[PDB]
C-alpha cells in the first residue's frame, strides 16, 4: 500500500498569509501523465471537503487562494493568503493504487492577539440534586491562546481529581477558544459547603480572575 | 441509515444505508470511508456502474456493499464487529458534473460497537445570573449528561439563535456515560423578553429533548 506522509504535522499562520503542507509519497502516483493526489478539509465537527483533485484541479465551490502542485512522488497545498475560516485538518489522498490511502492529516492553527477570557459560573440546577449528583461548572469564553489554568476552590479549599475539562476549537471567525471546567460532587459533598469558587490563570490576564457564589443564594 | 447514529454489539453485522441521487450520472460510484474517533480516514470500499466492487483486503474478509436500484440505496455490511469498527462512517458520493470530479460526503454516522445499552440524556439548565454576566452580555447554557452512545447535536431556539453558540465536546465520565455542555452568549437585556430553548437530539436513543433555560 503506498504511504503518504505529511509535513509539517501542525502550523500556526497569521491571517493574509501563506500556508506551505507538502505530502510524499512512498511510490509515484502518476498513471497516464495524471497525478492522481487529492487535497481535503476537515474543518472542526464537519465531515471532509474535497478541495483539489488530481494534483492541481480545484473543485467546484473551492476559493481560488486554494492551489496545488507536485508530481510524482512530492506534493504541495498551499492556501495563498490564510483566512479565519481556514482553521482545519487537511489531508492528502492517493487514488493511483489500491486502496486508495490518505496522508495523517495536517493541522493548521490561526494565529491572532492575545484575548483574555470572559469567566462566568453556573451552580448545579435543584433539579440534578434531587438526583444526588452536583454538577458546577465555569466557562471560559473567547480567549487565546489555548493554555489557561482552571482551578476549583471549594470553602477556599483547593480542589483535585473532581473535575474536567473541556476545549472547542478555534472558532471560524474569531480564532478564538472557550473552556469548560465541570467539578462533580455527591448531593451530600455540595450541601456540606458554602462558596464555590473557579479561579482562572492566562496571559491574557495580569492578575487571576475569580468567580463565585454562595450555595443558596442565585 | 446516513445520519443515524447508534449502537451494534460485538460480533454483529453493522449494516447502514445511504440514500443516492446520482446513479444517472457519469463516473457515478459510491466509496465507504470511516474515520475511528481521534484518528483519521480509512477507505473501505466502492460499488460502481452495474453493482461492480472494490474492497480494501483489510476488510474484504466481512465487508459487502451492495446497491438497490429500485430505491436508490446503497449499503455496507460489516460482519463480525468489534469495538476496532467504532468510527464515524461516510458515504461518499462521487463523479463529474459541470466542468468538475465532485465528492459529497453527507453528513456522517457514528457507530458504536458495544455491549452496553442505549441511554437518553438529562438536560439540566446553566441559568443566567448575576455570575454569568459581562458587560451587558450573559452567557446561558445547557449540560446534557449521562447519555449513551454518542453522539448529541444540539441546537438553540431550533437553528435561529447560532451566534454566540459554543457546543462542547463530549467527556466520557467515570459511570461509561457521556456528558457535554452548550452555552450561548447573548445581551442581558433579552432576558426577559427572549425565550432560550436548547434543542438535543440523541439519535441513538430516537430521543430529543428541549430545555427552556430562565433566568434566575
Known amino acids: 500500500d503506498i504511504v503518504l506522509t505529511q509535513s509539517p504535522a501542525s502550523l500556526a499562520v497569521s491571517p493574509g498569509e501563506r500556508a506551505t503542507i507538502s505530502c510524499r509519497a512512498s511510490?509515484?502516483?502518476?498513471?497516464?501523465?495524471?497525478?492522481?493526489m487529492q487535497w481535503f478539509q476537515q474543518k472542526p465537527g464537519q465531515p471532509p471537503k474535497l478541495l483539489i483533485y488530481?494534483?492541481?484541479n480545484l473543485a467546484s465551490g473551492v476559493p481560488d487562494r486554494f492551489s496545488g502542485s507536485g508530481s510524482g512522488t512530492d506534493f504541495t497545498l498551499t492556501i495563498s493568503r490564510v483566512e479565519a475560516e481556514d482553521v482545519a485538518v487537511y489531508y492528502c489522498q492517493q487514488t493511483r493504487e489500491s486502496p486508495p490511502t490518505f496522508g495523517q492529516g495536517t493541522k493548521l492553527e490561526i494565529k491572532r492577539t492575545v484575548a483574555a477570557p470572559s469567566v462566568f459560573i453556573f451552580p448545579p440546577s435543584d433539579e440534578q440534586l434531587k438526583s444526588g449528583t452536583a454538577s458546577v461548572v465555569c466557562l471560559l469564553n473567547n480567549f487565546y491562546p489555548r493554555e489557561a489554568k482552571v482551578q476549583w476552590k471549594v470553602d477556599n479549599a483547593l480542589q483535585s481529581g473532581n473535575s474536567q475539562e473541556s476545549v472547542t476549537e478555534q472558532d471560524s471567525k474569531d480564532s478564538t477558544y472557550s473552556l469548560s471546567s465541570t467539578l462533580t460532587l455527591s448531593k451530600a459533598d455540595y450541601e456540606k459547603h458554602k462558596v464555590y469558587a473557579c479561579e482562572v490563570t492566562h496571559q491574557g490576564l495580569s492578575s487571576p480572575v475569580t468567580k463565585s457564589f454562595n450555595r443558596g443564594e442565585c | 441509515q446516513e445520519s443515524g447514529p447508534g449502537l451494534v454489539k460485538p460480533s454483529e453485522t453493522l449494516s447502514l444505508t445511504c440514500t443516492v441521487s446520482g446513479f444517472s450520472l457519469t463516473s457515478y460510484y459510491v466509496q465507504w470511508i470511516r474515520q475511528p474517533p481521534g484518528k483519521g480516514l480509512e477507505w473501505m470500499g466502492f460499488?460502481?456502474?452495474?453493482?461492480?466492487?472494490d474492497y480494501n483486503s483489510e476488510f474484504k474478509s466481512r465487508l459487502t456493499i451492495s446497491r438497490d436500484t429500485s430505491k436508490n440505496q446503497v449499503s455496507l455490511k460489516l460482519s463480525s464487529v468489534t469495538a476496532a469498527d467504532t468510527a464515524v462512517y461516510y458515504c461518499?458520493?462521487?463523479?463529474?458534473?459541470?466542468?468538475?470530479?465532485?465528492?459529497?460526503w453527507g453528513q456522517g454516522t457514528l457507530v458504536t460497537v458495544s455491549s452496553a445499552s442505549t441511554k437518553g440524556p438529562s438536560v439540566f439548565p446553566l441559568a443566567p445570573s448575576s455570575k454569568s454576566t459581562s458587560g451587558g452580555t450573559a452567557a446561558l447554557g445547557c449540560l446534557v449528561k449521562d447519555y449513551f452512545p454518542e453522539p448529541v447535536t444540539v441546537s438553540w431556539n431550533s437553528g435561529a439563535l447560532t451566534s454566540g453558540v459554543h457546543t462542547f465536546p463530549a467527556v466520557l465520565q467515570s459511570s461509561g456515560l457521556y456528558s457535554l455542555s452548550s452555552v450561548v452568549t447573548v445581551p442581558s437585556s433579552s432576558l426577559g423578553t427572549q425565550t432560550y430553548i436548547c434543542n438535543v437530539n440523541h439519535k441513538p436513543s430516537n430521543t430529543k429533548v428541549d430545555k427552556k433555560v430562565e433566568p434566575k
Open positions: 460499488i460502481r456502474s452495474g453493482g461492480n466492487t
Open positions: 461518499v458520493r462521487g463523479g463529474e458534473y459541470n466542468w468538475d470530479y465532485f465528492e459529497y
Open positions: 511510490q509515484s502516483v502518476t498513471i497516464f501523465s495524471i497525478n492522481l
Open positions: 488530481r494534483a492541481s
